[PDB]
Design a protein around this ligand. Structure first.
Ligand SMILES: Nc1ncnc2c1ncn2[C@@H]1O[C@H](COP(=O)(O)O)[C@@H](O)[C@H]1O
Ligand SMILES: Nc1ncnc2c1ncn2[C@@H]1O[C@H](COP(=O)(O)O)[C@@H](O)[C@H]1O
Lengths: 814, 815
């Protein structure tokens, strides 16, 4: 029966117009959601619109996936334990070019689309930079036409929502799924077993992994759209499920399931890591084998073509177990011999390093691996012996480096170094900015570099101009499009054409006008949430990193208090009004970080209620900072704070976001700030403080905070205020911990950059006075931000690591 | 923004034609399922078709539910712990007259709709006749245009799938939900809390239930369509969810959650199940009562004076008996009414249906269990009991013995609360399930209550839906009936009376006989392509499909089969009327006797089916995994219907009505619903054998000794020898000693007593079967006289005599 060539997407799309969209929106409210207008809540109207947009998303998805099965390209598998997706609705509409049509449709139906947008929960799937880089990458990979996949874990509670109670961080569950996720599709049909524990039985045949405990992995598909090229790739997230003496099988059921429950560590983190690797790989091998278009059968069983058809990117060491897992499947199940299987593994795998210092590098005790992944241990020991023989022959009689490069690390209880596992198992290893990729070959991994120099590359991070310009900042996208068109949205380097407009009067005030417009929008939100009062004409001074000593929101605080003391000593002096905003989540259990949050709010209570200060200084702690808040605050920011101690940041990614939206930057010569300053010119940045070589020199002679205390009176004053209980009148000794750390054991040298930080902030105040000059510097920043598009990043990953050609040409259509 | 009048169901259904259906089948496969033809499986195409059909169903649902909100009718809530629904695909297509168009649509896309229909799981939400009754009841309530809801629990594990290996029943897990269920809709929005444990705090205010442990109940709605009248009602099933230092509150997760997982082959968990369904349902009822106004979800009404006018709760058996105390709890504790008004509201609101026959089967709970789990409800039950015993003490001054006989509290080993007594005290009506049944209720088990309030006690004889059990499952039969009398009979079964005119019509006789043979031929084929078999399709189709219980007497059947066998081996050349005797039903785990019975039936088969001399004259089949979908296949194919329960042990029966509707003649006892069936059909046109209820009483009176029969029936002794010496289990000679010793020494159910009258009655059957003309004339007489046994007739009576609403057979507008 060829009658079923009539089972097709052919003309299910419809015309994508106002007429068809509202008929569709009505289908979904009533037939999908089983509601009517009598009962429907705003959330229902959101779900009905989501499904209406989704029909058009999956139409193109079916087409893209078909195209892959008939073209048979190299498929690229992006592995991550964090996908920081944010909201989906507006993004799907801009990328499909449906925003105009939907806005009008919902309008004609009595609905307001901005309301409905604000109802969508942030996807509880990521935590910080690691996770948003993944999301930006997904969006760029689809825009550049790559057959790409995001594979991760579907977390049922993400990482906690942050609420501030009495100035203290409290954590609350993030049940972002409680009403369901319309963007996902459960696939009960593709449930796969993931094995734990057991023992290895040595048949003189192969090696069998027997007696194991089983956990079921069930996949959820979410489609991800390219920017107006009709390609729509897959994000595929695994959910843990249990199968069905004593009924302690209850414990086994509960323990199986909390693999999907939360982010962050015992067995659980390692359980989570194997889980994602083992399910993803079964999916990988399956597609490799069943490659003939229209044909479900496993037609291709020769693995010599595996590295030509599959690429696996290991985002940090979290998915590292992919290496020995791939080895397990090829040797044990597929019965290829060792050398042949290893060559395949190495050619398939690639590793990205994100972290800066040898101690954050992931390690697992042997006894743990031995108990839970006994076969994987053997495979790791085996990889290790042959890698160390390869080292032996390349560097004879060198016993020291031999044990320096070993995957097995000695001490009190042997640990296995997963970063060493990654380097040996992959054809490429990259760092995430230029300086970071350099210290990787200089220090952290020099022994490996000397063995295989070719392996080591750089790939500077980036940001999608979709979400981080066109979506969150329509005003700025617009005024740019009037001078140069909209080619820049998928080719950011074209922003340089804006350098022709540094001296155009109309453009300078249009940039100023858009900033002011975003400030007003955000200010209004900041009143109906924090119920204070923001001066929309003040300088919006923003710092939004995660709370942490090395990120130095304590250095910002000192500046805020310096500003407060000056205003109060001379209340008649003219001052540039400032709204300082600090946002970010503190890790539970990290006590100092919870203190830093309380300090920020404590200062707020004083400065926001001093009659003398008026509206010249406002301090706000931004609650529950996340992707959607970042979309609202980054556009409205004037000053971006990147003030980590030099030598501690690899990249940074939020800085790029600020640069794009017309904030000037105050930052240290560290991470992504270096290359940003390079692109823009030093004079268009506000760099201050010690460089990395200044840090080392201070370390070498010994850091004493007391030296700075003794010679800077304005600094002494603040400490005496923190000491005496000025900022916590009820509990005078509240900030005792902070003070004693600042004075006696500060690993991150806050006092040492204090002086230059405040002089710098003064130079920042002076520029702010002259809005023409201020804006012209902003234009120079914006015109010069093209490099930090993730379209540029993924194009490099594609050509230098993956061996696939980026392509901006359209896939046909449904 | 008065623009939202365009947010409407208006024209979203589209024309119910081949071209729209195939288009929408494409939308659903690709957009809803996120599949294409390259990856789709038969399962996927099933889901796609289901989603296509549901579209039309919910179109009518929205309208119906709107309609109720604007007429503000008395709304009726059918509460049950079982809903034995079966498949929904075909039933929805017939009730919405979409069957032909879907069939055509699927054909043109290169699919077989019958293949697709076979994919879908039987609804695993029920067990037996209790649950199947509710499903028929829902279908009827909707056809008769009643604002009716069906409330229960969404069970995940289903029940179990019967597998037969080596003649033994093995129970497999029936996870009918692993792939989802396109017919339901989840309502996370309407998640309600249910409370457990805690303690009661007496304040000079009211009483306060505090320190409780909380389980959340999430609803799932499923539409149920009337027959071509465009009204769609709701089935609303609850699912248990746990909320979100020691993790040992992992039990809390488990101990909740598996309230939903399982039916019960009773403990704390069983009672949690009952309170769960009740507390959630009552919150939902009151909620809907308060939201009386069209277009708005405001608590517009808080005057509970009209509650009994707007609400009817139907307590099906004692399982949801806690509705009564809970309804007192909400009204007194939460709505701060005074006890007297609330009680008057409670009694006028609830009514009780007893389904069982014996004083033993009925539900009691230890007080210490209630004291711990539902501490507030125990106090309320004690208060109810105090006041109810005041009415009794007033009615019968000084009759001390009846004060304790009628009490909700039973003294004994442990103090128990009697739920049957609770239901009779808190309801305005109580009904039996057949005439004989209802009569024994006022004569025996509730005699004391009947003397108190005789008017309380009604009969509502059970019934069956002519949609599922005629039109749907026997399309061949419904068609040849329609030719003579039209198709008005489908919602007015009485109209089948007009078939009596046609008893001597030769064309109708050959049509009825031809339809029968067609189904026989068709069911025999299903037997071949689904199992190793044989089956002479011309033989008399002898069918018993109950559940396996000593009282059901599939052993009386066995003894008859072996009787025949011996005769065929005594006189091989003497013509015997060929028979295929088929026995189906599930044992119930733990019941040691039932599993032995199944083994016995199969072990008989092994011998008989493979005996050369017997040939194709006698075949014995155990029918694996009996359920609604199989019922639909076997029932239309049956010639003879075994309803042979020991007299007075079956309350009604319901399968018996199915066989009668479908051209089978009945062999049965003067028991349950048979009494009324023979009353309609005429004694003449029914094979009624064995002791009557009063002969059973009289055998207990003189004492039952099975050895008497053994000694005066030579044909019976031989059968016992064969089972004992291992003629049916040569590898395990003593396999059936448990059965022998039960039959011979302690038969609670008198199998030997009816043995002789049974076998003679079977011979009159075999004789009549020899004359196809006369056999069919009798069949016609059964079918044509089946009208009483429509569940429509039943629901009408419930509506008019218990709920105080008027049935309406009129068509609601249209999409
Ligand atoms: N063998 C195939 N031929 C054509 N299309 C396919 C094939 N396998 C999968 N697809 C498409 O790719 C999608 C994703 O399937 P998979 O890659 O198997 O997870 C499916 O929805 C199909 O639309
Ligand atoms: N106040 C109302 N006015 C009109 N229709 C309603 C109203 N409340 C509920 N409905 C309809 O009845 C259905 C069931 O709602 P409920 O009775 O709240 O379970 C809803 O899906 C609506 O279609």
């Amino acid at each position: 029966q060829e009658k079923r060539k009539q089972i097709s997407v052919r003309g299910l799309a419809g015309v994508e117009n106002v007429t068809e969209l509202k008929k569709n929106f009505n289908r979904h409210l009533h037939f999908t959601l089983v509601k009517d207008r009598n009962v429907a809540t705003p959330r229902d109207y959101y779900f009905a619109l989501a499904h209406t947009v989704r029909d058009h998303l999956v139409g193109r998805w079916i087409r893209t996936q078909q195209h892959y099965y008939e073209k048979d390209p190299k498929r690229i598998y992006y592995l991550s334990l964090e996908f920081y997706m944010g909201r989906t609705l507006q993004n799907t509409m801009v990328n499909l070019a449906l925003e105009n049509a939907c806005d009008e449709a919902t309008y004609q139906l009595g609905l307001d689309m901005e309301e409905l947008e604000e109802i969508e929960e942030d996807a509880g799937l990521g935590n910080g930079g690691l996770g948003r880089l993944a999301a930006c990458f997904l969006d760029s990979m689809a825009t550049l036409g790559l057959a790409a996949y995001g594979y991760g874990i579907r977390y049922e509670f993400g990482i906690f929502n942050q609420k501030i109670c009495g100035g203290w961080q409290m954590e609350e569950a993030d049940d972002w799924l409680r009403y369901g996720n319309p963007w996902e599709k459960a696939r009960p049909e593709f449930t796969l077993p993931v094995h734990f524990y057991g023992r290895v039985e040595h048949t003189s045949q192969g090696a069998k992994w027997v007696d194991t405990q089983v956990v079921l992995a069930m996949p959820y598909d979410t489609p991800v759209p390219g920017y107006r090229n009709n390609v729509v790739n897959t994000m595929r997230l695994w959910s843990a499920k249990a199968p069905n003496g004593y009924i302690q099988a209850v414990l086994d059921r509960n323990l199986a399931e909390n693999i999907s429950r939360v982010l962050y560590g015992k067995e659980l983190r390692l359980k989570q890591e194997y889980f994602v690797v083992a399910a993803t790989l079964q999916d990988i091998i399956r597609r490799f084998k069943s490659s003939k278009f229209g044909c479900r059968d496993p037609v291709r069983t020769n693995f010599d073509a595996f590295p030509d058809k599959v690429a696996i990117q290991l985002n940090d060491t979290h998915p590292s177990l992919a290496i020995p897992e791939l080895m397990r499947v090829l040797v044990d199940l597929e019965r290829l011999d060792w050398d042949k299987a290893w060559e395949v593994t190495v050619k398939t795998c690639a590793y990205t390093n994100h972290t800066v210092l040898p101690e954050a590098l992931e390690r697992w005790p042997v006894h743990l691996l031995e108990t839970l992944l006994p076969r994987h241990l053997q495979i790791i020991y085996e990889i290790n012996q042959r890698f160390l023989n390869r080292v032996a022959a390349a560097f004879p009689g060198d016993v020291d480096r031999l044990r320096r490069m070993s995957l097995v690390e000695e001490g009190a209880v042997k640990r296995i170094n997963m970063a060493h596992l990654c380097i040996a198992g992959s054809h490429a290893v990259n760092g995430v900015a230029r300086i970071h990729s350099e210290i990787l070959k200089k220090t952290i991994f020099k022994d490996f570099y000397e063995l295989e120099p070719h392996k080591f590359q750089n790939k500077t991070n980036g940001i999608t101009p979709r979400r981080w310009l066109v979506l969150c900042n329509p005003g700025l996208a617009e005024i740019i499009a009037e001078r140069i068109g909209e080619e820049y949205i998928s080719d950011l380097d074209q922003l340089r054409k804006l350098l022709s407009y540094v001296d155009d009067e109309a453009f300078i005030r249009d940039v100023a006008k858009v900033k002011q417009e975003n400030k007003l929008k955000f200010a209004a939100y900041l009143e109906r949430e924090y119920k204070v009062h923001i001066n929309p004409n003040s300088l919006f001074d923003v710092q939004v990193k995660r709370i942490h000593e090395y990120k130095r929101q304590l250095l910002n605080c000192l500046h805020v208090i310096t500003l407060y003391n000056r205003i109060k000593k001379e209340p008649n002096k003219f001052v540039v009004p400032r709204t300082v905003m600090i946002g970010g989540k503190a890790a539970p259990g990290y006590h100092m970080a919870k203190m830093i949050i309380k300090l920020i709010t404590a200062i707020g209570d004083v400065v926001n209620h001093d009659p003398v200060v008026g509206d010249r200084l406002r301090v706000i702690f931004l609650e529950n900072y996340r992707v959607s808040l970042a979309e609202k605050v980054i556009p409205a920011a004037d000053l971006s704070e990147q003030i980590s101690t030099a030598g501690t940041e690899a990249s940074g990614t939020g800085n790029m976001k600020f640069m794009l939206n017309g904030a000037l930057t105050i930052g240290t010569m560290d991470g992504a700030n270096v290359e940003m300053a390079e692109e823009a010119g030093e004079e268009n940045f506000f760099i201050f403080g010690m460089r990395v070589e200044d840090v080392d020199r201070l370390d070498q002679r010994g850091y004493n905070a007391q030296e700075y205390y003794d010679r800077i009176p304005e600094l002494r004053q603040i400490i005496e205020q923190l000491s005496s209980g000025f900022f916590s009148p009820k509990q005078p000794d509240l900030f005792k911990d902070i003070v004693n750390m600042l004075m006696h054991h500060d690993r991150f040298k806050v006092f040492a950059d204090y002086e230059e930080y405040v002089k710098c902030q003064e130079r920042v105040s002076a520029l702010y006075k002259n809005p023409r000059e201020w804006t012209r510097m902003v234009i120079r920043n914006i015109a010069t931000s093209g490099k930090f598009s993730s379209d540029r990043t993924i194009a490099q990953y594609a050509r230098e690591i993956w061996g696939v050609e980026p392509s901006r040409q359209r896939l046909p259509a449904p």
